Amino acid sequence: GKYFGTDGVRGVANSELTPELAFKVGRFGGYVLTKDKQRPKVLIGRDTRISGHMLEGALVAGLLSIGAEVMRLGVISTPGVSYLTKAMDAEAGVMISASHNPVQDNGIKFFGGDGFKLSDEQEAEIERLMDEPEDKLPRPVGADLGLVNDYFEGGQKYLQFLKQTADEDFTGIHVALDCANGATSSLATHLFADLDADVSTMGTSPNGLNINDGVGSTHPEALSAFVKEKNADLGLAFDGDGDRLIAVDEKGNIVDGDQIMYICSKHLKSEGRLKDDTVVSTVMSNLGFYKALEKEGIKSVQTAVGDRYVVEAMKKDGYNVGGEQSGHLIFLDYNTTGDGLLSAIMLMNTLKATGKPLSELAAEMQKFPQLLVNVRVTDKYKVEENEKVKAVISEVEKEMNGDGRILVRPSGTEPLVRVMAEAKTKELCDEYVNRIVEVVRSEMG
Amino acid sequence: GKYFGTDGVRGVANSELTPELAFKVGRFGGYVLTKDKQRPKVLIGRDTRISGHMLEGALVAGLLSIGAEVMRLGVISTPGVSYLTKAMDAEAGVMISASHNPVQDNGIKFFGGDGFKLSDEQEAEIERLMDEPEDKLPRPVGADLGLVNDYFEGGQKYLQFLKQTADEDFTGIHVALDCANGATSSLATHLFADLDADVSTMGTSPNGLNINDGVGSTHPEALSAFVKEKNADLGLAFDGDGDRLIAVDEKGNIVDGDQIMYICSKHLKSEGRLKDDTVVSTVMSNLGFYKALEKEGIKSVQTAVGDRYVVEAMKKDGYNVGGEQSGHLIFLDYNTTGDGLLSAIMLMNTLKATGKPLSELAAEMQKFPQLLVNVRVTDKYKVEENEKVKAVISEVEKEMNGDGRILVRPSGTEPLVRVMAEAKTKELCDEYVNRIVEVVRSEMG
């Protein structure tokens, strides 16, 4: 009915995301991808979550009961699953994980031959079957049955590829890594050490219970302190599945996905590699990202939140680069989903080639301050129109005239409305927001 | 209701023995064995059957959804599973296989802590649960979930143990091996080669479709020809799971489980190791086995067909050795189920120590000829009594007076009765059987 959301199937493993269901998934989904040849070739990959194994076995059982030849990969980032499912011309690819969420949660994700999430048509049918109450799909027996050749060497192919996209070894750089105790634990540390960089690690020590546990892109303050401690040049914080990246500069400060997009797209434009010198990004990006983009003559396209949209955009118009503030950047020259380590290597290429420190590079793009004030109200949904509100906003919008931005939306969870303001400084934020907030409390209370 | 038969659960994999059911098994059975500690320790092992993997994954999924720490072993004979489940003090042990059957079939088998099939009480409850239609067993989540550490090194521990029970290396012996393309493929050939024996192989080349395919204990004629071809001293034919053994002498002839029991128990008695110098065996054994046993002053106990009974017997009365004509011999000094390779090493110990060739040793025990004649009849079940039949038999029984044996039983499959006769020679068989057969056709036709 509705198993496949944004990020595939998710639940708390065993309770909601039962192995029964991870069976039905691989069984039916392997049927759907079976329409080509009698013997599809799914490959499957997972992070360090303890539920990993339980799901991987039930999923592979499903796949094998409908003839699919199956290639376990072991622990590997979602990037590497997509890269390999393309490079090995495999009918599909699967990733058991639930990036950056806590360990108890997990999820199944699918990739097609091309390295892209499955067509909404396909997922459609997978769900069609998963609600019939008769498993009338074929049951091959004897020699028709699925086959299963492990391929734990997959990892070092996706390593072998990342290693070629580094414009020279990184000698002379001290990098700290925090790998969320996840799929990137063993991949990253081999990579940057095989690229001749002084690596200092942390969060690289998974036990299947510690993924994303005060480490990783979502919790970068540990890494913030570790950089200063080990006095490194920068810190990289991947998340659970190796699909995001948040950096940290020698000064200890955080370097979100807008600043990484800025930094990298700018370097890329200096090699002629930025395609039509444009960059896709989402609403969520910070006004000062668009400002410093103009300043470097890089144009931009905005899309709605979520990388199905940011990738929908780069596809048609053939764009080279696109990203989110989350740290989720796509370099389509190289791979078809967000790739933490790719991001990180592009960032290091920048650093090496410019001899600047990460603080300097990220200072070109100046973030605008934000401000949120939430006011409790009687009837939060009647703010869509108002004889005052609706007006106030518009005036302040024009008063700002490109140097600012306002956003007022009612909450779901509660009975209050959220006023929010980008401005060039903290005191303009304060002025503007207070204005709107006043004409709201006039109505409600 | 009735899933656990003699040899565990069996079916044709996927069609009857579905992965769904191999899930319910490990889930419920891991509950039943969970009553001790919150974190049982099942270990699991399989043969080369292609359905192996599919079942192993669904089974491990079950086990993990109820907290069991689980130890994959890979491919290993059922012997080695039992040996290890004892030596590692593990709550249970599991073997996915269906020995000597064709590849399409498979099966789940259970062993307790002690190395013995599970108590009929336990299997009882496993089935109790498997027919409730509500999976109300706990669903641990987060850190309670199952854990899974592979242990593919298990194999070479059970090797390390077999290698100690060989009374000296086997230098100077040429042995041919036929391992049914099964679990014993890699174990045997390392073993006898690490014991310094000239090994010539066959059936050692599994691809998950060729198990028991004109090789192995059930189909020994290939091996019969191979021994003569490679002019070896003897041939060993294990079956799919490494639980049986049939030998073949340098002359090419077959050496069934009665002759191996004779040969080995006799050697053992010569080391004082045969306990109370007795040997357990089943009805199925050949009169001349009992004769040559008397001749060497070894006493004997008979039990009904099947090793649950042959082991029930050695348990109470503390017997050292017991076997079946199948090749399924138990040496309880050393292990708790039938052990093909153990048998084989005991046989080689005999050979080495006596310097005799296998033909000579197996000639001490002289088999009596058998004869079967099946007569079609009108009402095959009224032969339990007869005014002629019942008499004829009894007379011929006493006429034989210990030198013979008769057995007449009606068939199920068809409408006819089966007359059968052991005698000292082929022409006594012919006489005796013809007598009975005559007084049967008198009635029926």
Numbering used by the authors:
A (entry chain A), B (entry chain A): 2 to 446
Reproduce, without paraphrasing, sentences from the article in which this PDB structure was first reported.
CdaA (also referred to as DacA in some bacteria) is a membrane-bound cyclase with three predicted N-terminal transmembrane helices and a cytoplasmic catalytic DAC domain. c-di-AMP is formed from two molecules of ATP by enzymes containing a DAC domain.
The B. subtilis GlmM protein displayed a four-domain architecture typical for phosphoglucosamine mutase proteins. While one GlmM molecule was present in the asymmetric unit, the typical “M-shaped” GlmM dimer arrangement was observed in the crystal cell packing. In the second structure, a phosphate molecule (PO4) was bound to Arg419, located within a loop region in domain 4 at a similar location as observed in the B. anthracis GlmM structure.
